[PDB]
Amino acid sequence: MTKIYLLTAPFDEEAKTGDGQYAASLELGFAENYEHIPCKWLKKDKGDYSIPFPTGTTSIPEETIPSAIVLQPVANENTVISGYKLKDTVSSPEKAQEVNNKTVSPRTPKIIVKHDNSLQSLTIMDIYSQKPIQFDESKVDEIIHSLETKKVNLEKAIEDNNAELSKIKKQKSKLAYLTRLYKENKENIQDYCTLNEYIEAHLFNPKFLSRHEKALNNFKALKSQFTGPVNLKELEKLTDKLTGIKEYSYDFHSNSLPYDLEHDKSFRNFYDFDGLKESIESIIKELEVLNSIRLDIEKAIDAYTNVKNKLENTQDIIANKEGCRNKLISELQTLIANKQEPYLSANEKLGGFYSKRKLSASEGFHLAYQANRRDPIKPEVIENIITKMKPIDEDTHLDIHIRPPDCGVFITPEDIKKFQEAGIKVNITIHEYKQNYTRRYLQQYTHDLMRQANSVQFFNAEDRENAIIAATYGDCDKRNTTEPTGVAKKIREVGEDFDLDKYPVQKYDLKGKSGLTVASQKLSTEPDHPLDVVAKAPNILSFGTIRPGKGFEEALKLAQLIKDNSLSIHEKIKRVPIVKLAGDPQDKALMKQIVVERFGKTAVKTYQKTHPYDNRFNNSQRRDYWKNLVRELNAKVKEEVAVLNNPYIEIYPWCEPHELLDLKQNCKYVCRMDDMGMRNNGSAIISVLDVGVVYTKFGSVTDDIFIKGGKYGNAVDIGEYRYGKYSLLKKEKEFKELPKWLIKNPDSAYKRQSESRDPKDILDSIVAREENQSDNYRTVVEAQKLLKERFTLKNAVDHLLENIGLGHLIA
Secondary structure, eight states, X not given: OOEEEEEOTBSXXXXXXXXXXXXXXXXXXXXXXXXXXXXXXXXXXXXXXXXXXXXXXXXXXXXXXXXXXXXXXXXXXXXXXXXXXXXXXXXXXXXXXXXXXXXXXTTBOEEEEOTTSBEEEEEEEOTTTOOEEEOOHHHHHHHHHHHHHHHHHHHHHHHHHHHHHTTOOOHHHHHHHHHXXXXXXXXXXXXXXXHHHHHHHHHOHHHHXXXXXXXXXXXXXXXXXXXXXXXXXXXXXXXXXXXXXXXXXXXXXXXXXXXXXXXXXXXXXXXXXXXXXXXXXXXXXXXXXXXXXXXXXXXXXXXXXXXXXXXXXXXXXXXXXXXXXXXXXXXXXXXXXXXXXXXXXXXXXXXXXXXXXXXXXXXXXXXXXXXXHTOSSHHHHHHHHHHHSXXXXXXXXXXXXXXXXXXXXXXXXXXXXXXXHTTOEEEEEESOSGGGGSOHHHHXXXXXXXXXXSEEEESSSHHHHHHHHHHHHSBSSGGGSOOHHHHHHHHXXXXXXXXXXXXXXXXXXXXXXXXXXXXXXXXXXXXXOHHHHHTSOOXXXXXXOBOTTSSHHHHHHHHHHHHHTHHHHTTTSSSOOOEEEEEOBOOHHHHXXXXXXXXXXXXXXXXXXXXXXXXXXXXXXXHHHXXXXXXXXXXXXXTTSSOOSSTTEEEEETOOHHHXXXXXXXXXEEEOOOSSOSOXXXXXXXXXXXXXXXXXXXXXXXXXXXXXXXXXXXXXXXXXXXXXXXXXXXXHHHHTOOOOTTTTSSSOSGGGOSOOSOHHHHHHXXXXXXXXXXXXXXXXXXXXXXXHXXXXXXXXXXXXXXXXXXXXXXX
16 A cells, blocks of 8 residues: 655664654654654665675765766865775676776765775766776876876987087977987887977977976876875875866876967967867768768767868967867867767877866866766665665655755765666755755756656745746746746846856656645753743843854844943843853854853853863864863853853853753743754754744745735744845845846855844844844744644645655545
8 A cells, every 4th residue: 555665864863853853753743643654765774775796895974876976076066086995805896896987976986995905996078088097006007107208208319409409590390300210210219209299399399398297297296196095085086186076187098298279379389270270171081971971960060160260370379260179179178078989989099188177166066966866776775765765556655865965975866767677756855955055956956856856845935936936937046047037036146147057857747746845843841832932031042052153143143232332231121131042162262252251251260271172172072171161161251250241141152951952941032043054854943932932034935924914924033134234135126225236146155144133133123123022022932833734744744745746646
């Protein structure tokens, strides 16, 4: 019959963060409410799925796939290195090498190390040739020897030609002599160097010597990694200096020195344009011969013959004539990067590097994604999963939780198709979509995930609407679409004449599969009556680890602003509010600024010193140092030895659970303004709705029902404008009292700012609420109704059943 299987592999299988907590709450809601629906989530700890490994080789990270856990660090413009280890003296390091040959990306270098933790093989892929390049120690030694032989041969050629090269005075005349003499192998020099290096060595020796020394030093550093233990901190920089992300000093496709041809001024006139023309003519002749006997030949012929016509006039390339060189460089780079026939069989007659290009985040992440999808051993762990999801009936559903790229990396469109081919309805749950607006490659990845899925389940309405807009209009970015609400966004932000980055996705019916869900949770103590919450010591409260950007600094500024205008606050309300802070001390600076206000600046020294703070304390003494500090002071003050500067702030670092309950019962106002704000998936705000009035951040994931007229409009005080003070609508309003707000910085990070709301406005709103004895009772009752009717396990399970088409089973 009906059988629901949850899957959040491999992230948060122990239920510690939001994703695992949500999955556990959903499973508990299924178990408690529907005892006839066998719902359970697959875990690696249980006998559900095991990490796929080759016959005698284990992944370098423990119990991870070396191509799936790399998506998360790659998406942040960071290159990390993973791979395999034979774990034994002899393990046939070949099959694992295949896993390193198909799952290799320029941002994801692959390694194979021996049993004694010594590097054996290094497979990388340059951003220009886009081909997997193994770098075994023998190959590195061969490359170094080839470079040395080329250097000595070129030195011999220079010392031989110096007798006649001095007679020629014109530099241009020397170009012809070297080119003609290079055509004849006096001592078999054509098999060691290329035509560019012959002229460069003779005429521009310091530049050629510098380039050769740079390449030789890079390769020597690469060779040095095979001597002792392998460390995954210097190989990343080596890969960056090898692939070309940060530096490209050697062209592995042609085994020759690279030439930028754009940032190589004073040498553009000496480039082997004639040699490139001959190579392209040979490629054209080969294509003509192949076509006479006869994937696409005509398209390749047209693409290659275009480059030949662009090099007919040499002067048109050295001097940029209506972008002639740029188009030529782009076409050459596109042709070289082609790995399909007949380009692959013809690219060996010309170099693989023609200009230095910057690997964008989108291109790098897409290459890593394709490498991950090309995994030959990944589908195995799918089969094991299927091996546990048997028998398969017509009422078997799979709920895959996706948080690009954290929660979902073991699931791919091929994986989803394999799941559906066995008779499983895949329901992809989007934990965050609008969050990755600055990184739209993750948006493309999750869009493919929804497209291949049977059903889609979103948490909020704004991200769901944005995803629907992207799916039904082609591009992830609504600015580059024809939608009336998206075309106006481009004009007001960057104008209608801006070449924004394109993130094309295939169109699909996302509205007919999408749905809505909530982050359910279970609370032990029932919330108090709203009448008791209004007159409940209106003090500002905030939990959580004290980190930069968690709203703790804003609470400190709130307390400070209370201190200066305490008299203004007084004579207007019964009691002055007090900002109460509690949680894990993690930021030393934030904790220092918190404690200076608490009991003065001087008393923070007449302690810090005596008992000072070493920047080594782990989180068993970092916690038990601010506790001792706040216990020694606030007690030196009651021994009336000192005075609490700022009596309107109270700090309780690492408070006990009973102390936390006392703080919750003694505070009506909470400041739960995190980096994202109010949302249907954020449990950190859902767990605090029962305390009272909660001030949050007006984020982009607001469900449009908490603003001014929704079913829970007064439940939380998000604010007036979205994103706090960083709103573009507000900036437009103050300006008209119109420039491009997002100009010269597309995809700005203003939607994820820390201090979005101004402390002064928060204080003014807080005072304006308690002075009405606005209308906190309405806020408390609406928050309680939202907690009891929407943020419940049964509601989340019912939403999931409705989204997966099982609404007839809802009680």
